[PDB]
Design an enzyme around this catalytic site. Structure first.
Site, PDB file in Angstrom:
ATOM      1  N   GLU A  50       0.852  -1.190   0.000  1.00 16.17           N
ATOM      2  CA  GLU A  50       0.000   0.000   0.000  1.00 16.17           C
ATOM      3  C   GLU A  50       0.889   1.242   0.000  1.00 16.17           C
ATOM      4  OE1 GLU A  50      -0.744  -0.038   4.856  1.00 16.17           O
ATOM      5  OE2 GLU A  50      -2.248   0.912   3.587  1.00 16.17           O
ATOM      6  N   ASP A  94      14.295  -3.688  13.203  1.00 13.06           N
ATOM      7  CA  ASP A  94      14.839  -2.516  12.520  1.00 13.06           C
ATOM      8  C   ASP A  94      14.041  -1.221  12.751  1.00 13.06           C
ATOM      9  OD1 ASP A  94      17.003  -1.430  11.156  1.00 13.06           O
ATOM     10  OD2 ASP A  94      16.066  -1.645   9.202  1.00 13.06           O
TER      11      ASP A  94
HETATM   12  C1  LIG Z   1       7.379   7.751  -0.218  1.00 11.66           C
HETATM   13  C2  LIG Z   1       7.375   6.262   0.138  1.00 11.66           C
HETATM   14  N1  LIG Z   1       6.207   5.595   0.135  1.00 11.66           N
HETATM   15  C3  LIG Z   1       6.164   4.286   0.439  1.00 11.66           C
HETATM   16  C4  LIG Z   1       4.948   3.602   0.436  1.00 11.66           C
HETATM   17  C5  LIG Z   1       4.916   2.247   0.758  1.00 11.66           C
HETATM   18  C6  LIG Z   1       6.090   1.570   1.079  1.00 11.66           C
HETATM   19  C7  LIG Z   1       7.312   2.245   1.069  1.00 11.66           C
HETATM   20  C8  LIG Z   1       7.344   3.611   0.763  1.00 11.66           C
HETATM   21  N2  LIG Z   1       8.513   4.284   0.765  1.00 11.66           N
HETATM   22  C9  LIG Z   1       8.564   5.594   0.463  1.00 11.66           C
HETATM   23  N3  LIG Z   1       9.730   6.253   0.465  1.00 11.66           N
HETATM   24  C10 LIG Z   1      10.970   5.753   1.092  1.00 11.66           C
HETATM   25  C11 LIG Z   1      11.846   6.957   1.439  1.00 11.66           C
HETATM   26  C12 LIG Z   1      11.746   4.870   0.103  1.00 11.66           C
HETATM   27  C13 LIG Z   1      12.426   3.707   0.464  1.00 11.66           C
HETATM   28  C14 LIG Z   1      12.438   3.178   1.758  1.00 11.66           C
HETATM   29  C15 LIG Z   1      12.117   1.672   1.713  1.00 11.66           C
HETATM   30  C16 LIG Z   1      12.668   0.956   2.954  1.00 11.66           C
HETATM   31  N4  LIG Z   1      12.161  -0.450   3.029  1.00 11.66           N
HETATM   32  C17 LIG Z   1      10.862  -0.794   2.581  1.00 11.66           C
HETATM   33  O1  LIG Z   1      10.462  -1.953   2.668  1.00 11.66           O
HETATM   34  C18 LIG Z   1      10.035   0.216   2.088  1.00 11.66           C
HETATM   35  C19 LIG Z   1       8.722   0.358   1.918  1.00 11.66           C
HETATM   36  C20 LIG Z   1       8.489   1.581   1.412  1.00 11.66           C
HETATM   37  N5  LIG Z   1       9.654   2.227   1.268  1.00 11.66           N
HETATM   38  C21 LIG Z   1      10.608   1.405   1.675  1.00 11.66           C
END
Ligand SMILES: Cc1nc2cccc3c2nc1N[C@H](C)/C=C\C[C@H]1CNC(=O)c2cc-3[nH]c21
Length: 273
Positions: free
Chosen positions: A89, A135
């Protein structure tokens, strides 16, 4: 199968967790996150009720999935020859806590209280579902900016919760407890409480309290920002050297600093909108 269902957008981030892209489900225009992780990069493997070999992450996300919005929801997953793809999501608009703190610096205590409380509810839910995150940190927390609701992400370092000792760890070292540093041994709940102490300090001070191994082992907390005595006390309690000196989740949420938390909507209205 993956192509005919989803529309891939820009890269949101990449790291130890793999590569995460923004996306849209074609059928209903739902905003999604598309996570790719290489098979070679997965050491922690698990099994579904089906008897299928998947990354532990998939197992853990399925175990925590419900109407509760404090944990990221796994919508679907796919296996490729050399990778696994996770459909998660995606709240919109959203910002991770690390970026949020970077922009604001130290958070007002009222805001930190609301955020920390929501994190606690999310972690308790995980534990109640038999899942240990391993984590907990600002980078692994998303803020739904409209609703004021926080979400735990990235269960790639997680494990099934157990009452026996963990001798493996793959999370973030600067959030790991002194018993891990010194002995390579820890128990789930008390290690989680330590990381929560690091997180809380980070919220109210704008940075983490310790960088080096020696700092973690010593566990002397210095406050670089103005923080109330009550909050300082809670932080020092969570960061007790001996794991059995750390508060239970109940004790944290019963702490005087944790009283009278704002609702998420009230939080968004005052602090985010
Ligand atoms: C802006 C954003 N929206 C998200 C929505 C769902 C899941 C993730 C997610 N991540 C971001 N931005 C972040 C800064 C990008 C990477 C981090 C990464 C870190 N590990 C994950 O499983 C996960 C899930 C989301 N994002 C991550």
């Amino acid at each position: 199968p993956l192509e005919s269902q989803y529309q891939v957008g820009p890269l949101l981030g990449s790291g130890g967790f793999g590569s995460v892209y923004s996306g849209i489900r074609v059928s209903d225009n739902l905003p999604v996150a598309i996570k790719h992780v290489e098979k070679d990069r997965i050491s922690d493997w698990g099994e579904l009720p089906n008897g299928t070999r998947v990354p532990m992450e998939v197992v853990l996300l399925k175990k925590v999935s419900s109407g509760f919005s404090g944990v990221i929801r796994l919508l679907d997953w796919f296996e490729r020859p050399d990778s696994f793809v996770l459909i998660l999501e995606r709240p919109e608009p959203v910002q991770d806590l690390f970026d949020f703190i970077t922009e604001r610096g130290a958070l007002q205590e009222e805001l930190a209280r609301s955020f920390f409380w929501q994190v606690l509810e999310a972690v308790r839910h995980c534990h109640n579902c038999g899942v240990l995150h391993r984590d907990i940190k600002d980078e692994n927390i998303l803020i739904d900016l409209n609703r004021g609701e926080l979400k735990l992400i990235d269960f790639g370092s997680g494990a099934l919760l157990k009452d026996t000792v963990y001798t493996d760890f793959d999370g973030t070292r600067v959030y790991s407890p002194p018993e891990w540093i010194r002995y390579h041994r820890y128990h789930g709940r008390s290690a989680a409480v330590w990381s929560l102490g690091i997180l809380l300090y980070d919220m109210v001070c704008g940075d983490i309290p310790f960088e080096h191994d020696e700092e973690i082992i010593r566990g002397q907390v210095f406050f670089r920002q103005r923080v109330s005595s009550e909050c300082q006390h809670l932080i020092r309690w969570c960061l007790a050297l001996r794991p059995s000196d750390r508060p239970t989740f109940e004790e944290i949420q019963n702490h005087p600093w944790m009283q009278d938390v704002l609702l998420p909507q009230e939080t968004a209205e005052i602090h985010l909108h």
